[PDB]
Design an enzyme around this catalytic site. Sequence first.
Site: not given
Ligand SMILES: N[C@@H](CCC(=O)N[C@@H](CS)C(=O)NCC(=O)O)C(=O)O
Ligand SMILES: N[C@@H](CCC(=O)N[C@@H](CS)C(=O)NCC(=O)O)C(=O)O
Lengths: 139, 139, 139
Positions: A29-30, A50, A53-54, A57, A92, A95, A103
């Site tokens: 982000r920086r 991304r 996020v994965n 989850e 991952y 990658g 990845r």
């Molecule tokens: N959130 C995924 C979990 C399984 C999966 O394949 N995860 C990653 C593998 S890197 C993915 O493809 N996420 C979608 C993305 O990266 O936008 C799903 O519901 O298909």
């Molecule tokens: N999901 C964040 C967790 C740590 C963090 O800084 N969380 C909030 C702080 S309000 C953030 O900046 N999220 C990104 C956004 O709000 O788009 C990360 O991976 O950097």
Amino acid sequence: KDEVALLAAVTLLGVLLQAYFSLQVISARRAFRVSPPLTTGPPEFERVYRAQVNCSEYFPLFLATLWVAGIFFHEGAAALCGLVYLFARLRYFQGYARSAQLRLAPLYASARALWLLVALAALGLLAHFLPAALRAALL
Amino acid sequence: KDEVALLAAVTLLGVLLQAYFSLQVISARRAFRVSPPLTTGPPEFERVYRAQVNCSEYFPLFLATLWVAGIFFHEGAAALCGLVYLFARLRYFQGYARSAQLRLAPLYASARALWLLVALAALGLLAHFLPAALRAALL
Amino acid sequence: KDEVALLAAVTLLGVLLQAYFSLQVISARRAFRVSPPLTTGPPEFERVYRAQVNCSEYFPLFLATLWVAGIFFHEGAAALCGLVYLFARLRYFQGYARSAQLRLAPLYASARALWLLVALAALGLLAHFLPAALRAALL
Ligand SMILES: N[C@@H](CCC(=O)N[C@@H](CS)C(=O)NCC(=O)O)C(=O)O
Ligand SMILES: N[C@@H](CCC(=O)N[C@@H](CS)C(=O)NCC(=O)O)C(=O)O
Ligand SMILES: CCCCCCCCCCCCO[C@@H]1O[C@H](CO)[C@@H](O[C@H]2O[C@H](CO)[C@@H](O)[C@H](O)[C@H]2O)[C@H](O)[C@H]1O
Ligand SMILES: CCCCCCCCCCCCO[C@@H]1O[C@H](CO)[C@@H](O[C@H]2O[C@H](CO)[C@@H](O)[C@H](O)[C@H]2O)[C@H](O)[C@H]1O
Ligand SMILES: CCCCCCCCCCCCO[C@@H]1O[C@H](CO)[C@@H](O[C@H]2O[C@H](CO)[C@@H](O)[C@H](O)[C@H]2O)[C@H](O)[C@H]1O
Ligand SMILES: O=C1CCCC2(CCN(c3cc(OCC(F)(F)F)ncn3)CC2)N1c1ccc(F)c(F)c1
Ligand SMILES: O=C1CCCC2(CCN(c3cc(OCC(F)(F)F)ncn3)CC2)N1c1ccc(F)c(F)c1
Ligand SMILES: O=C1CCCC2(CCN(c3cc(OCC(F)(F)F)ncn3)CC2)N1c1ccc(F)c(F)c1
Ligand SMILES: N[C@@H](CCC(=O)N[C@@H](CS)C(=O)NCC(=O)O)C(=O)O
């Protein structure tokens, strides 16, 4: 407490891994100047973001299987799979920080260790419920 | 059951906090007319929505540390940090509902309480594994 | 172990439900040709994808209430609500895979079972803390 301390250490290590992934996304982000609440940016920012996020989850899915397999099959064997999964998640993220192709392999290595936890949770639960069901059906 | 009921109450309060954050994001969808599956909208909608996404991601990280620190260090001390973290998350959501700057301080106050849980989980696990390792190495 | 095996089975079934939702989102990426890290696409892809994101977010909320209600109220009654919630989540995903209107009803059926777990967790915790508080206040 004694029979769950390995599961608790693998758990804490997984939390520290998520802290590492947040530190890396906050660096992107920086670097690419991506301002919150924006989740879109250059191809590499969206990839690092991304990857995190994965991982987030999958964290409760990992925790659930680690604890169930650890308590119903064998603590040391579930904690061993727990480390294999967490190391594949580090790879991952690293990658995805290069490309989406890079990845792919550590994603299937993490899916591998996750299915291993699910099998040990299932085998442990079957070894608990099945003998009593076999007795009831035969009675 | 007796030694985990404070951890279970702080857990239920955290779940009720997530219910509050969903009620607030669903109000912003009616107010700014944002229709699902759309996650984009005015600067303030994306801020309220993003505040909830972050809280949800941190919820299992909070649960893991709360339970590990509560069982390996001290239940009351981990439940005290658990409340500090949850109150900082309410302030983070309320701050993000005004602006991204206004969320910065309660975000570091939540990070503070989260590192405190991680330290108590680590100290508790070290007090468990270390004496036996010191004995084995010296033997 | 004996008094938590139903909670552990409902937990493993919830993990397997999340695996199903990932298999479905990965099918939509091949069908509509949506490439990672892209989360945007046709109206139906965003709906299947969004159904999974929501389910993932609710998974730790479900786990927390299932385990607290199961240990503080009654294991079989919390595991019964756990199945009702998981079946409503399958219907929510299948509904969102058709339209946003079609997901509305199984979403309120899942919210129903989730509030039932919260009530049993609250009743169980109140039955634990309240008698001792009534004694202390009267003493
Ligand atoms: N959130 C995924 C979990 C399984 C999966 O394949 N995860 C990653 C593998 S890197 C993915 O493809 N996420 C979608 C993305 O990266 O936008 C799903 O519901 O298909
Ligand atoms: N999901 C964040 C967790 C740590 C963090 O800084 N969380 C909030 C702080 S309000 C953030 O900046 N999220 C990104 C956004 O709000 O788009 C990360 O991976 O950097
Ligand atoms: C529906 C029915 C289910 C069918 C189940 C089919 C099982 C197949 C049996 C093959 C033989 C069993 O193989 C078993 O695997 C485990 C886990 O990898 C091994 O565990 C092993 O882990 C790694 C290999 O990854 C080695 O470094 C280590 O030496 C060893 O501990 C056991 O030592 C082995 O005995
Ligand atoms: C790698 C080695 C690790 C190094 C560890 C360094 C520890 C530093 C020691 C400083 C003195 C200890 O300070 C200890 O902090 C805790 C938690 O804030 C206090 O706990 C306190 O919480 C709040 C303050 O936030 C007060 O309202 C309350 O009166 C008190 O219970 C203890 O009463 C205090 O004894
Ligand atoms: C702040 C105070 C809280 C106020 C609480 C108010 C409670 C209202 C009491 C109404 C009567 C109780 O109703 C109670 O509900 C539960 C859960 O649905 C029932 O449980 C039932 O589940 C389903 C119905 O969904 C049936 O298929 C099954 O036969 C039965 O086991 C109990 O058999 C019933 O006795
Ligand atoms: O709760 C929050 C809110 C703000 C964001 C952060 C704070 C800054 N972060 C880091 C990471 C790091 O990495 C050390 C490693 F990788 F060894 F863990 N070092 C220093 N800061 C990570 C994200 N956070 C957080 C998240 C998970 C935790 F477990 C935790 F304790 C705190
Ligand atoms: O499961 C779902 C699916 C649909 C969405 C909701 C349903 C409507 N919500 C609320 C919140 C609220 O706030 C009371 C407070 F804040 F005191 F908790 N009051 C009334 N409805 C919150 C989101 N939900 C839900 C989420 C978490 C829960 F814990 C729960 F029980 C239900
Ligand atoms: O961890 C990962 C990383 C890559 C993505 C997947 C791997 C491929 N998936 C499936 C699902 C499925 O459905 C069987 C059902 F529905 F019966 F569970 N069958 C075959 N593959 C699901 C997503 N995954 C994963 C997720 C959760 C798990 F519990 C698990 F074990 C593995
Ligand atoms: N993440 C939601 C949780 C509650 C909710 O309504 N969930 C779904 C119901 S299908 C939703 O509307 N999500 C927004 C979307 O689909 O974009 C919130 O914070 O409001």
